[PDB]
Amino acid sequence: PSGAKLLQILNVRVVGSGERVVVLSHGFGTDQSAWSRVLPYLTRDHRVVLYDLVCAGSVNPDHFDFRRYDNLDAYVDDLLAILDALRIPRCAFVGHSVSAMIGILASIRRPDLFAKLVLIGASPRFLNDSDYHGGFELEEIQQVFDAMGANYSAWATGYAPLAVGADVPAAVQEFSRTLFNMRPDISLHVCQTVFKTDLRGVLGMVRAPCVVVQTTRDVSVPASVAAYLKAHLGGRTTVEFLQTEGHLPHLSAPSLLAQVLRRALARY
């Protein structure tokens, strides 16, 4: 619905400066504050655009239109509206988890706009299929969805340490803070939307060069998924391995992740 309104509603911030513009797009259970530790490594060299997904706890939940956001294309529309409102013609995009999915879709809709993709904790499909290992079974996610409805607080308390992976208490506390900030119904709806999404068929339509960041264990992304993305993404793709584990390296290992981001965003 907007330039100015949307910029306010989604907490859009532009920091740093440079000819190289970089958009940082957070994942489920967090907001843009997840990038706070890596941000100082980018703002000397880059103009950084940060924003909150509509489902973030830091956005007023009465903006969340359940009908509209029952597919990821609606989230892509927001991203493209923001970039158009800021008059940005070209950028690199760093997306975590659901935002990696959003980045892939957005790079296909507007190949002129996305010069490079950096995908963290990324998967094209979480559910297993005939000759495809996503990491999840239908009955498993059914139980997760039930837990989310029956006792959101208990679910979130259990999930936070598993998502962080490594024993980094401060990161668990931080992810828990934002996860508890999400409205329980919106959280469930986002999860349901993600688990219905299957990007496999469109990966070859991506034209941008892509860096897939792989940690040594991610509860939501089997190791074989990074290799799948490398084999099927349509642009020049590399897989960069972090020497630690987790689904949220920007929270748990920000200095290590920053090394990869600086190298990936050097030229595009």
Ligand X SMILES: *C(O)(O)[C@H](C)[C@@H](O)C=O
Residues 124-183 that bind ligand X (CB under 6 A): none
> Which residue, 84, 124, 85, 119, is CA-closest to 99?
119
218 catalytic? Reply is: yes
247 catalytic? Reply is: yes
Using Cβ positions, the residue closest to ligand X within the complex turns out to be 97
Considering the rule CB under 6 A, would residue 191 count as an interface residue with ligand X? yes
Give, in order, the Cα–Cα distances in Å from 257 to each of 13, 83, 173, 262.
Answer: 21, 25, 19, 9
Considering the rule CB under 6 A, would residue 27 count as an interface residue with ligand X? yes
Residues 215-244 that bind ligand X (CB under 6 A): 220
Residues 93-122 that bind ligand X (CB under 6 A): 97-98
> What is the rounded distance in angstroms from the CA atom of residue 5 to the CA atom of residue 25?
19
Q: Please, which residue, 47 or 220, has the CB nearer to ligand X?
A: 220
For strand 21-25 and strand 47-51, is the pairing parallel, antiparallel, or unpaired? parallel
Catalytic hit among 97, 123, 176, 187? 97
Catalytic hit among 31, 52, 78, 218? 218
Q: Count of residues for the chain?
A: 268
Binding residues for substrate, by number, are 97, 191, 247
CA angle, corner 215, sides to 80 and 20, nearest 5? 35
> What is the rounded distance in angstroms from the CA atom of residue 26 to the CA atom of residue 50?
9
Q: Please, which residue, 97 or 107, has the CB nearer to ligand X?
A: 97
Residues lying near ligand X in the complex (CB under 6 A): 27-28, 97-98, 191, 194, 220
Catalytic positions are 97, 218, 247
